[PDB]
Design a protein around this ligand. Sequence first.
Ligand SMILES: Nc1ncnc2c1ncn2[C@@H]1O[C@H](COP(=O)(O)OP(=O)(O)OP(O)(O)=S)[C@@H](O)[C@H]1O
Ligand SMILES: Nc1ncnc2c1ncn2[C@@H]1O[C@H](COP(=O)(O)OP(=O)(O)OP(O)(O)=S)[C@@H](O)[C@H]1O
Ligand SMILES: Nc1ncnc2c1ncn2[C@@H]1O[C@H](COP(=O)(O)OP(=O)(O)OP(O)(O)=S)[C@@H](O)[C@H]1O
Ligand SMILES: [Mg+2]
Ligand SMILES: [Mg+2]
Ligand SMILES: [Mg+2]
Lengths: 285, 113, 437, 160, 249, 319
Amino acid sequence: NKFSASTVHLEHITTALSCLTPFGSKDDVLIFIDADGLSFVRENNHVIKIQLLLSRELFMSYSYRNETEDHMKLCVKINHILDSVSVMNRNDIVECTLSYDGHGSPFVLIFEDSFISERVEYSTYLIGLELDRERISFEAIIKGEALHSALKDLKEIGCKECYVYAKTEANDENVFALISKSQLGFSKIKLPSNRSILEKLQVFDGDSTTVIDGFAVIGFFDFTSFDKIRKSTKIASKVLFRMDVHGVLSVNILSQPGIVIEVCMLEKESIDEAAQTEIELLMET
Amino acid sequence: ISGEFGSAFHGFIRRVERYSNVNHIHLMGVKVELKIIVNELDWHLEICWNGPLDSVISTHEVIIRCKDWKVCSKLYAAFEEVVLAISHDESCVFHCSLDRGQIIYYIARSKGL
Amino acid sequence: GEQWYEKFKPNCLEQVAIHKRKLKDVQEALDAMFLPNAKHRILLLSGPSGCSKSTVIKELSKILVPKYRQNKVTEFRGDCIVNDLPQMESFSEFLKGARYLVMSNLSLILIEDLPNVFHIDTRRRFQQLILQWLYSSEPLLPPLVICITECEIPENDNNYRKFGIDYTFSAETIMNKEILMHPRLKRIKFNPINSTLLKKHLKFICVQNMKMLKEKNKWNKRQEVIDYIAQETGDIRSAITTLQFWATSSGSLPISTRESTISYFHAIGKVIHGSHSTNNDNEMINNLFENSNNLLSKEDFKLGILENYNTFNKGEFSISDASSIVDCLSECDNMNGLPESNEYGLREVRKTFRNISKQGHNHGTVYFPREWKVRKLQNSFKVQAEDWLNVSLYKYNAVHSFRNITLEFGYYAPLIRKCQSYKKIDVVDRIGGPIEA
Amino acid sequence: SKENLPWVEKYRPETLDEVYGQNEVITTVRKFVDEGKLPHLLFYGPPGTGKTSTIVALAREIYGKNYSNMVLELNASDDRGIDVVRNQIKDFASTRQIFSKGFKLIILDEADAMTNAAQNALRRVIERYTKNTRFCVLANYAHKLTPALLSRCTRFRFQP
Amino acid sequence: SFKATITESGKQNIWFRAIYVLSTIQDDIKITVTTNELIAWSMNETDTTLCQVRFQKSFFEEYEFKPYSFRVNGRHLTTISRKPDGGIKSFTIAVNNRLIVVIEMDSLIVKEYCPQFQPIKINYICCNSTLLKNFLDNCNVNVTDEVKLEINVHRLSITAFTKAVYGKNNDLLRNALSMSNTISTLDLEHYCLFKSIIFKLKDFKNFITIGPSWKTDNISLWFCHPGDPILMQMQKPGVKLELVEVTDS
Amino acid sequence: LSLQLPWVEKYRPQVLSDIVGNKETIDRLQQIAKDGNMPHMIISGMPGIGKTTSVHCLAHELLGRSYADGVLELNASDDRGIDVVRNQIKHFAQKKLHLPPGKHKIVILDEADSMTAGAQQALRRTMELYSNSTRFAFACNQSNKIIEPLQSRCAILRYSKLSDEDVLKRLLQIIKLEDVKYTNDGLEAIIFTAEGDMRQAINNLQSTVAGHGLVNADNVFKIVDSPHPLIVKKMLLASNLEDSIQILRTDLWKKGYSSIDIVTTSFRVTKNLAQVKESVRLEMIKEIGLTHMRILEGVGTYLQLASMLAKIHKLNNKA
DNA sequence: GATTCGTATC
Ligand SMILES: Nc1ncnc2c1ncn2[C@@H]1O[C@H](COP(=O)(O)OP(=O)(O)OP(O)(O)=S)[C@@H](O)[C@H]1O
Ligand SMILES: Nc1ncnc2c1ncn2[C@@H]1O[C@H](COP(=O)(O)OP(=O)(O)OP(O)(O)=S)[C@@H](O)[C@H]1O
Ligand SMILES: Nc1ncnc2c1ncn2[C@@H]1O[C@H](COP(=O)(O)OP(=O)(O)OP(O)(O)=S)[C@@H](O)[C@H]1O
Ligand SMILES: [Mg+2]
Ligand SMILES: [Mg+2]
Ligand SMILES: [Mg+2]
C-alpha cells in the first residue's frame, strides 16, 4: 500500500470530520497525504477555506511507503464518508485504518470490531486563500470558550453581517469586539482585556513589525462565512486571529499533538465606508 | 448461537440489515473467511468476518436477496448447529440441525456474478 | 402633508361614492346578520380594488354596531409574527380570540387583509377554519364580514400549482364550492364606481381645495380633467390620487391612472364584437395580449371562442365564416401553446367577424364552455367502467379492455343483464346512462 | 498528456493570439485589457466560433497565475437557479480580491439556459458590484436573455 | 432617564420568562416606566386577554429614573435577556429613539444592543400553583383550544377540552379531547364561593409557567358572569403579575 | 488588472438635473424633491431610460444626511419573500426617525415586477398602515406585474423612450468630459444603434473609443451591429422573394444569427407592423408560427427560413 | 363587450 495509517482513537476522526460539517454538507473534500500527516482541506465559493491537519504522531501506525511524490492528493465526496462512518462507535477495538494505493485506487476506510471488518472503499474524483505572513494588520490570541460563546450569541441574534474591531492602546487597553448588523442592528460584542480570556492583541500598521497604538482595524465579514469557524472553536483551547491588509482573516485553532485547524476567510469589499465611521464612533462611545 | 462467538456471528449476519438500499447481498468465500459484499455507486461495502471459521468437510460467490438472509438469521438464532453451503454462481443451501429435527433452506441466486 | 384620499375620507355614508341600491342591499344584509338568531353567519364582499368596500363597512359598523351593543371593527393582522406560535396558527388564535365578542362585547369583524393564501397548507387551513365557523355549533357568533379584492395575479416564475389562486385572486379561487354555496353565507359582489359618483366626488374635492386650485389657475380646467379621470378609471382612491398628483403639479404632466384588468367574458366580447373607440383590430389585439396575456394564453380562451362565436347575430351568419373560424381554431390547436397560435386565432376570429359585421345586429349572450361538464361525465363513466370490469372478473373469469367497454360492453352487456333481470347482476343499467338525440 | 485528447480539445487556443477569425472582437478585448478597463461583456454567435476559448484566454492573460481564485465560471452543467445566483454569485462578487488587487471575473457559459428569474436577480448584481467585478455572458440564442440583461452588457458578435 | 440593573440570577430568570410571555401574547412588548415600578403590559389583537408584569423599585438594585411609555418588539427583546448556556452578572437596561441595554457575562465579555422603540400612550379561588402548573403544562395547546374550569362545593375540577363542531352529517370537524383532573378541597388553599368559566389555555399556561421560575407559590382567581373578563394574579417579592381574559359567554 | 470604472457607472447621474429624457416627469420629481411630500409612486418604462437613477436621485435630494438610515433599497438580487417583506419592511417602517418637517422615509423597491404576489399583499398592508411615516417607490419595466391593489395607492409615472436629441445631448456631455475624438455621423450611428437606450449608447461609445479611438461611422459599425429587428423588418417587407432571400442570407445567416432568433424577431416585428392588411398580417403570423414549430422540433436549417419567406410572399403578393 | 330591464335626471 502506498499509504496506510491505523488508529484506535476514532473520536479524533469523528470530531475532525464534524469540523468540516458547517461547510457544504453535500460536496467534495480534498485530502493531502504526506509523511507529516494527512489534512482535510475544504473550500466554499472561493471565499473561505478550512484546513484540518492530523499529524503522524496522531496515529499509532503511519507508513507513507512512497517516494515518487512528496504528497498524495485525492478528492472524495464528503457525505459518502459521513454516511459510511456512521458506525455509532461500538463501546471491540473499533480500530480505524486509512489506506490509499496511488492514483486510480479508492480511498479505503477499514473498521474492525475484532470479528467484523466493515471495509468501505470511496471513489476518488478529479482534482489560494493564504494570508501573506509578512503583512498582518492585527493579531489576537483568545480563549476558545469565550469565542464559542460570542459566535453562539451572534447566531442567536442572526447577524446578517459582522464586524471585527482591533485597537490596541498606549496603556495596553487592548479592545477586541465583534460588531454585528442584524434585526436589532448594531450590536457590539467586546471581549475583555483580562489575561484569562485575551492573552495577546497586537495591532500593526502594515508589515506586521510596528506595534502602533490609537488606531483601529475594521473587518467587514459576511456572517455565513464567519459561522463556519463556530464548530471548530467548540473543541479549541486557544484561538489565534491573524488578519492581513488584503482582507484575509486567518483563524489558527489548535485543540491541544491534537488537531490543528486553518480557517481562512475573504473579507467583504465594504461598498460604503460610512458604516465604518459609524462602527468606530459606536466603539469610542 | 450460544457461546463466545454466538452474539458476534449473529451481529455479523445481521449487520447487512442496517441499510435500506441492500436488496442483493453477495456472499463470498476464499479457501477461511465469510465476506458479505454490497455493490453500490456510493461506496463499495465489504463486510467480512475475522473470527475463526470451520468447514464441514477457490472462490465461491452467490448473490441472493435480503429476505432470504433475514430467514437465514432467524434460523441461526434458534439453531445451535448450522451449515452454510455455497454453490458458485448458483444457490445457497442453509442446513440447520437439532441433534433428529433438521431444517434446510434452499435459496436460489438472484443475479449472476 | 397628507394624501388627499386620506384627508378627504368620508365622514358619513352620505359622502361615500356608492350606488343607492348597493348601499341598501348591504345595509339590509348587515342588519340581518346583526339580530340574534341571525340566518346569515358571515358576509362576503367581493369586487375590484378601491370600490369603497372597506369605507362603507367602516361607516356601517359605526352606526350599526352601537345599536346592538349591550351594556368599532376588529381586523386580522397577518404581520403579527408572535413568539412561540407557528405562522399557520396565527389565524387560528385570532379566530379563537375573536369569537369571544358576543355578550357585553360587540365588534363586527372585518377580514380586510387575508392570510397568505398562496401557500396551499395555510390556504386549506383558512378554508377549514372558516368552514368550522360557518358550521359552528355555538349558540350565536358575532357577525363576520370578509372583503375580497378581485385582482389578477400576473405571470411570474414558471411554477403554478393551485391553478386557481395562481391566475386570479378572487372569492371563487380562495373559497371552495362548499363555502360559497352555503345557506348561512351572504355574498354581495361589488361594481366599479360609475362616472357620475366619481365626477360628483372629484368636484367636492375641488370645491374644498379652491384656494390652491385657484392659486395655480387650474380651476378653469378642472371640469375637463375630472370628466377624463372619471371616464378612465372606476377606482375612487386611484382617481383621487391622480387628481392630487395633477393639482399639486405645476406643469403639463399627462394624467395617468392605473390600468384595470379585462375579465374573461370581457375579452371574449372584445374578440367577437370588437371594441368601441378602437377601430384598429391590430392595436386592440396587441394591447389585449400585452395587458391580459395571463387570460389569453390558455386553452379555456380558445374553448370560450369556440363556444361563443355562435352568439353573433343569434347564429344568423354564413356557414362559410363559421367554417373558417373553426378551421383556424383547429389549426391553432396544432401549435402547442405557442404565442403565434393564440395571436393568429384571435386575429382570424376578429377579422372574420369584422368582415360580416353591419348595423341591425342583435347578438346573443355568451356562456362559459361546458368542457368541465364533459370531464365530470367522463369521470363518472370511468368509475362505472371500473366497477363493471371489477364485477366482470370475480363473477366470471374474463378480462375486457376499456376501449371495448366504451364501444360495445357499455351497451350490449347492460342490455343482456336487463334481459337476464327480466327472466331471472349488480350492474343492470347502461354505463354512463342512456343516450339521447 | 495532450496526445491523449480529441483534436477539438487538443488545439483549443491558450492565448488570445491563437483565436483566429474574430479579428475585431480580439482587438477590442486586447485594447480593453491594455487600457485596464473591462466592461460587462456579452459574447454571442454560432457554436464552435471561439467564445469559450476567447473568454478563457482573456482571463488567463489578465490573471496569469491567480486564475483559480480570480475567475468564477458557471455553465449549463451547474445549477444556476434563483438561489445559486442569490448566494454563490453574490458572495463571490461581494468580497475583496485576492493577492494585491484587481477585478474578479464571473463567466456565464451558455447563459441562454438560465431562467428569467435568475437573470432578473443577476441584473442588480451586475449593476451593484461592477466596481470590482465584471461579467461575461456567453450565448448562442439571444432571445432567451432578458432585455434588461442584454441592456447592461457590451455585445460582441462572433461571426462564423 | 430610566435605568435599571439586576444582580440576582432568579430575578433575571423572571425577567426573561415575563418578556417571553409578553412576546408570545403580542409581537410588541409595550413598556412604560414609573419611578415607583416598571410595568410591562401586552394586548393581543383579539383584545380577549391582558397580561401585565410589574417590576417594583426593590426588584432592581438601582432603579434610577430622571424623566415614559415606549413600544418594543417582543422577539427582539426576548432574544436579548436570554440566559446563554455555560452567567450574566449585570443586566443594565436604560434609555436616554434607541433603547440601550448592556450585558456582561461572568467571563467579562460585554455585549450591547440598541433595539428600536416607539413612544405610545364574585368569588375567590387560591390554589397551589404547582398542581395547576402540572395539569396545565401536561396539556397540549395543539389539541386543546378551550379550558373548562368548574368548581364544586366539595372538589375543584379543571379539564382541557375542545369545542366540537359538526358539519353536513355530524362531521367531526373538531373533536372533544378532554384531558381532565379532579382535586379535593384540602389541596385548595382558600375557596370562597360567595360555577363554570370557559376561556383559553395557552395564555394561562404561559402565565402559570412564569411564576415557578424563581427557586425561592399560589395563584388567586376572582371572577363572575360569562360575558365579563376573568381576573388572574400572582405575587412575588419585587414582581407583581396580572392577567385579565374575557370569559366565554 | 487595473482600475478604471466603466463609463456607465462612472457617469451615472447623481442629481436630477443631469437626467435627460422625460422633462415633465423629471421636473415633477424635482418639485417633489423641493417640497418633500413624496407620494407612493410607480416608475415603469423601457430598460435603461433613467428609472433607477431617478429614484435614487430623488431619495438623495429628499433625505440628505439622513439617506444612510432613511432608505431601504431592496432589489431582485436580494431575497424579497413574504417573510422578508413582513419582517424587514415592518421594522423599517416602525423605526421612528426624526426627519425634516416635510420629509418621509423612502422604501425603494427596484424590480418590483419580479415579486411574489403574497409579498405584494403584505406590501399592501404595510403601505396602508405606515403611510404617514414612509413612502414607497416602485421601479419596474411594466406596471402590469404590480397587482391592482398596489397600483391603487400609487401615482403612476410612465417613462417614455429617450428621444435621439436627449441621448445626443448626454453623449456630447460625456464626450466633452472624457475628451474623445468623434464625427457627427459617428454619433448619429451610435444614436441609431442605441435605439432609445442610454446605457447601450454609453456602452457602444466606450467600446468604440477603446477599440479604435476616433468615433466615426466606420469604426462604430465595424464594432457594433445594426439592430437585427430592423433587418428582419426590411426582409419581411421586401417586394420580391429574391431580395428577401438575399437579405436573410447575407444579413442574418452569414452574420451568425440563430434561426430561432430570426423567427422570434420576425414574429415580434409582425405584431407591430403597419401598412399591411389584417388578413395578410394574420396569415404571416400563422406561417411564422408554423416555421417556429419546425425550428423547435429541430429542423432549423436555412431551407425552413427560405420556405417561410416564400409562403409570406405567396400570401402578400397574391401569388 | 352585449342584452335586458330598470332608474334618474333633465
Ligand atoms: N368619497 C369617497 N368615498 C369612499 N372612499 C373614499 C372617498 N374619498 C376617498 N376615499 C378613500 O378611498 C379608499 C377606498 O378604500 P376601499 O375600497 O374601501 O378599500 P378596498 O376596497 O379594500 O381597496 P383595496 O382593494 O384594498 S386597494 C379609502 O381609503 C377611502 O378613505
Ligand atoms: N477562433 C478560433 N480559433 C481557433 N480555434 C477555434 C476558434 N473557434 C473555435 N475553435 C476551436 O473550437 C473548439 C471549441 O470551440 P469553443 O470556442 O471552445 O466553443 P464555443 O465557441 O463556446 O461554442 P459553444 O457556444 O460553446 S457550442 C476549440 O477547442 C478550438 O479548437
Ligand atoms: N436619462 C438619462 N440621463 C443620463 N444617464 C442616463 C439616463 N438614462 C440612463 N442613463 C444611464 O444609464 C445608466 C443607469 O440606467 P438605469 O436608470 O439604471 O436604467 P433603468 O432605467 O433602471 O432600466 P432597468 O429596468 O433598471 S434595466 C447610467 O450609466 C446612466 O448614466
Ligand atoms: Mg379598504
Ligand atoms: Mg462554450
Ligand atoms: Mg435599474
